[model samples]
Target: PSALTQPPSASGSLGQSVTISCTGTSSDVGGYNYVSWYQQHAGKAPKVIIYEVNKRPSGVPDRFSGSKSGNTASLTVSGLQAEDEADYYCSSYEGSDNFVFGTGTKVTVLGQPKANPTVTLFPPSSEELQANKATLVCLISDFYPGAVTVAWKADGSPVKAGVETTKPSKQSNNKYAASSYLSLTPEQWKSHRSYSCQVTHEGSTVEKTVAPTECS
Candidate 1:
């Protein structure tokens, strides 16, 4: 199946604007007018702001607009207000009652405090080893502006399967943190002595590496 893709983040000053794009195949977004956009604050359920391409829902502010062209759908936030600094997600009706959600885009209003995330990687636990799987954990903390991308690699190649990452959630100090988990087969885990967790935040990337021996 094809995937709907979006950039992990966007940012603008308090009174400025930003546009986020959602790209998908003709089988979904470009094929129909069912594209919709939603806004979600941390720890809250998403609220639909735009539906059927360009129509805004009742009570949605005029600053938000949605449009589509070809295989990409776009959401534009004008006159960026305080409440507009939140995560946005785009979705589309594929067919036969099936719908697809694209990756999220976080909007950060400039002039707010920004911090680079601290990254830590942990090797698979014994509990996971008992299950014939090695699950590596990548903890990202103290980040501001929220959105981040986590990628995994084994012996220098992308390890795309069995990898899960979370959007940043609020931390006690008002920063954000997120976690990513990478699962591997026992044989696969030892086949290559190295694994890496790479995180990208606000255009900067940090990586941490681990090996089986690191586990206790």
Candidate 2:
């Protein structure tokens, strides 16, 4: 069986280099020469970069290189450019028409200007309250680079379940927008004094809080 793992994220400054590692067992990356790498920008389809360990596809940049050693395969992006800032995934062909993909890695090119996202929180609607459920909406807008983390809190406590966030949507103005949803029982929503939506972008965080009283 094929199973692969990779670092969740990697970073480097412009003109520098960034290397992402893919690790697998002998039944996959280590045992086969069919390892391939793909590059995907936000809201775009992935394109093959390297195939068969170190071979580059047609029209791919020379700066993107690949190599393998034992159970680990590496993709190195030399002279990192703005376009190189994207997600990378490694895949290897397993026997019997099976293939396993890596966990994927987000490559961030440093020194690029960071755009802060505007966070707006919306309280539950009257209809939802009638149904005994409360749904909170967090609208995130006007961000650059298409990377943001959203977190929800109830009465200052971390909330995990019933939370959904969409991928960053590219706007015509070259910025990005996204939305997050948090669901709760009507009682839970009313019992809590406040609910918060926290958005993190480029190491900066913005949070918006809404009170239950506003729903009245």
Candidate 3:
């Protein structure tokens, strides 16, 4: 798994709109809508701004919004306030007890800012299977200003082998993003059967799982 990347700073004027971007490959934010956003202030923990890409949690101001395209995700803050000058971060659920975060961006208030923060991802989804090897990739897009970690768990147990992580980077749009990969033996996948990806950020924890499902 890889760490999400974000811009160092973003500037905007009061009552204006400022956008921050997170970029990475498809393994983090691609396969599903598990991306989330958070806001942090000095001397306090981070707070949730958005979840599952566009779904806002209770108590989040409507001025904060989220969206994603291909392997790219974005966060927009409208009606900016000087008090909003803090760190902002984006996250994505990485299956198997892991989560990814964008690099980090500083939102600055200015007049008609031209260089807003942005992020991007590649493919957004990647999977590979061989005769005896099985692999799953997790990717996330449009994240900024935070630390990220990814882990793997099987049947509720931790996987301590063959875990790989990468750093996020800027996309063509200038957003921050990251990706991660978990590899296992085909037998391990079959035996474990159930797997989960856990994401933790801004004092919130979310989990996504791969379970057996019957198609109608």
* TM-score (C-alpha, index-matched) for candidate 2: 0.56
lDDT, candidate 2, at 120: 89
Please write out the lDDT profile of model 3 over residues 80-197, one tens digit for every residue: 7655776888987777878888887778665422221222211112233335566655554454433445555675887767767676554433334566666766666667766665
Model 1 clash number = 0
lDDT of 1 at 196: 93
Better candidate by TM-score, 1 or 3: 1
Cα lDDT tens digits, model 1, 21-86, are 999998899998999999988767899999999999889995789879889899989887656767
The lDDT per prediction is: 0.86, 0.88, 0.65
Could you tell me how far off, in angstroms, the CA of residue 58 lies in candidate 2 after the best superposition?
1.4
Sort by TM-score, top down from the best? 2, 1, 3
**For residues 1-216, what per-residue lDDT tens digits would candidate 2 score against the true structure?**
336999999999888888899999888998889999999887589999999999998899858898798889999898877667678999999899999999999998887655899998999889888888888999999898789999998878888888999969866545789999988888888888899999999899999999866525
Supply candidate 1's per-residue lDDT for 101. 94
After TM-score superposition, the amount by which residue 137's alpha carbon in candidate 3 deviates from its true location, in angstroms, is 57
Candidate 2 error regions (>4 Å): 114-216
**Candidate 1: 10-residue stretch with minimal lDDT:** 166-175
Better of 2 and 3 by lDDT: 2
Higher-TM-score candidate of 2 and 3:
2
